[PDB]
Symmetry: D2
Subunit: 141 residues, 4 copies
Amino acid sequence: AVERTLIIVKPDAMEKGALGKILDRFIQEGFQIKALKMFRFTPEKAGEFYYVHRERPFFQELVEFMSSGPVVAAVLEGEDAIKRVREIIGPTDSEEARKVAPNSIRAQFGTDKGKNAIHASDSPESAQYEICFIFSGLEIV
Amino acid sequence: AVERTLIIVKPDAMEKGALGKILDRFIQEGFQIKALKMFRFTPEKAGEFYYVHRERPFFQELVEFMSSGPVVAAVLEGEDAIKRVREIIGPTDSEEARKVAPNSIRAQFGTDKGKNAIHASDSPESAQYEICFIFSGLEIV
Amino acid sequence: AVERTLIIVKPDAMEKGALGKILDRFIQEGFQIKALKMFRFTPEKAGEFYYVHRERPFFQELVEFMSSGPVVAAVLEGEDAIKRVREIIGPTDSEEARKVAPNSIRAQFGTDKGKNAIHASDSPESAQYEICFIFSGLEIV
Amino acid sequence: AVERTLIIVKPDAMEKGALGKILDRFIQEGFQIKALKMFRFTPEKAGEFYYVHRERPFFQELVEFMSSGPVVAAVLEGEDAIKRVREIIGPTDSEEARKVAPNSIRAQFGTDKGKNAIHASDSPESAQYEICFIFSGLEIV
């Protein structure tokens, strides 16, 4: 069915000047962009956004990085969007992405496991939570 | 348990200059205001916000009225907030509110069944939907 | 002439539950509220907002306090609004406000010189800068 | 000196899937994107945004088109940004752009004089007005 998912272009991809190319890729893949904005997570908001990983070992590093500079979020809409966007971005480790998914966003724009260019919702439940965390219904147009 | 609910102060109460009194009431009743903003529904957004009533006879009237001028929305947080806020606002018919709930917001500021001063979420499900429709997680502070 | 000015209800007045009373006061004084939102200054944004005082001795204290919790900003519109609103809020020192302007907002809700309940733009130039700092034309309705 | 200017990607370029390419162009030209969002002008807001042309013959057509679908605005920052961005987008008539500025955005993505892909601020005064109309200081990051 037609679905919505969230992506966030991370500070590393921002600094590399990759924003336009990343959005263009999703446009070429046939998604509609339903919301879009540049903003900056405070450490506290980044922590809330990533609440599921609060226990994980990488948490503090992720929260600091994701609040270290402005990011760009977009809502992507399309058939089977959540699964397809996951596949388009590729594995979390950018170097592994180059090895197993060489056309993926992370392979093209990611550096390593932490600076990996982009976030995408990983499930219908997380997509629902993540979209609302960043955009209200008023911002979806 | 501690809950969050949405209120919206409607154009009639706005024009009457009731906004400050209405917010004060909720403050005195012990609620935390977690988000607040003045905005204006387009007819389309008011329709989406009220999607559950799209089949009802009053729908078009409601949509037009709720997009006829600016409104103010707030997220209210407190113990049992969803049911308590409903009870504070009183029955939908302002005139009836004056008859059976004379201290209710609608009794005090409502005119009739349409110009009834204020909206509040009516269930945990609708609260969840309505808060996200108006406010992102970034606007809840 | 009809003017716009900015007010910000500060964390002290927020915690005191003064928000509704403060907005009511401005409503009773005959102002239109043209924009309204609850948000939180990062220390950096509070610094930029108060750039004129960057050299003053109180600057760091002010920046920290104004980013220590959520605040509410409003655009107030009315005849001679900038000077009238200044007068309604009263002298910066809440204690002195109680001595020389006993009906002023700061007399009623302010504590001292730092926790003084409320900010208002102090000139046409600062009003223009401050309103744009907090609200876009899209948020004025 | 370092300046800020506003661009808006119009509904025609949006529908053509040109958004990513357009932002990429500005990134390659060496600008920093300081603010970015997708939103929709109401006819009234489009009219206010374009107040200077309220007397012109094309006004109603422009207002309707610019409110006919979602658009994307960005704040671009860089040395001499206002003048350089004007030149990059090219003349207003897309067909003339193709004739006299074949590398310009309007030549590449514009259709004619009305569907001409993109808006940019045309002077320091209009840039100041336009940026504030769309983005607050809080949104510039």
